[PDB]
């Protein structure tokens, strides 16, 4: 009812394309660390053989402020356009 429970900040997991996900994550880490920094949050990357999932643990702000900045970068145009 008001107290009495383990458990305060939250964790949420951010949703992105394989495609997005090396532009996200950086060379091998070099721009998502950036936000876990302006955010302040953890930042915890997918496996290698596994669906495309960023983990982001904190509170129930700052958490989804990260997130909005991850799916910023799938519409964010980094690199070349000519095939």
Same mark, same amino acid.
């Given at each position: 009812?008001?107290?009495?429970?383990?458990?305060?900040?939250?964790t949420?997991?951010? /949703?992105?394309?394989?495609? @997005?996900?090396?532009? @996200?994550?950086?060379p &091998?880490?070099?721009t998502i &660390?950036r936000?876990?920094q /302006?955010?302040?949050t953890?930042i @915890?990357?997918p496996?290698?053989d &596994?669906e495309p999932?960023?983990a982001?643990?904190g509170?129930?702000?700052?958490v989804? /402020?990260?997130?909005e900045?991850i799916?910023?970068?799938?519409?964010? /145009?980094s690199?070349?356009?000519?095939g």
């Amino acid at each position: 009812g008001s107290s009495g429970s383990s458990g305060g900040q939250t964790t949420i997991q951010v /949703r992105v394309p394989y495609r @997005v996900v090396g532009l @996200v994550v950086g060379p &091998k880490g070099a721009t998502i &660390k950036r936000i876990q920094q /302006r955010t302040h949050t953890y930042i @915890v990357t997918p496996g290698r053989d &596994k669906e495309p999932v960023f983990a982001v643990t904190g509170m129930p702000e700052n958490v989804d /402020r990260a997130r909005e900045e991850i799916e910023a970068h799938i519409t964010l /145009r980094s690199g070349p356009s000519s095939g």
